[PDB]
Amino acid sequence: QKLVFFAEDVGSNKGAIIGLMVGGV
Amino acid sequence: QKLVFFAEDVGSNKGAIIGLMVGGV
Amino acid sequence: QKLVFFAEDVGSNKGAIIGLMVGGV
Amino acid sequence: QKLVFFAEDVGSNKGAIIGLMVGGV
Amino acid sequence: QKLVFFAEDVGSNKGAIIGLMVGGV
Amino acid sequence: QKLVFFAEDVGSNKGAIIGLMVGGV
């Protein structure tokens, strides 16, 4: 008997998350 | 009998998280 | 019998987390 | 002249993030 | 002239982050 | 002229971060 439980990149961020961006005012 | 429990990159951040960015005012 | 329990990069930060950035005022 | 820059819960976690959960084997 | 830069819960964790949880084997 | 720069709970942890938890083997 062999069992494998595999989970990867769960709720993970590998990119850009930005609330807001303003070049100027 | 063989059992494997594997979990990787759970809730992990490998990118940029920024609340806000302003180039100037 | 063989059992393996492995967990990596759980809640870990390997990138930039910044509350705010202002280039100037 | 009044400026406001406001951000909340940017990339934040509220609630459960679970890679895997097994009741039993 | 009044400026405000405000940020909260940026990349913060509230609640549980669990890589793996097994009731028993 | 009044400027405010405000940040809270940046990359902070409240609650449990658990890599793995096993009831018993």
Curated annotation (Swiss-Prot), chains A, B, C, D, E, F:
Changing G19V: Reduced protein oxidation. No hippocampal neuron toxicity. The record marks K2, L3, F5, F6 as: Cleavage. Changing L20V: In CAA-APP; Italian type. It comes from the Eukaryota. The record marks M21 as: Susceptible to oxidation. Changing D9N: In CAA-APP; Iowa type. The record marks G19 as: Implicated in free radical propagation. Changing E8K: In CAA-APP; Italian type. This is P3(40). The chain holds residues 686 to 710 of 770 of the full protein.
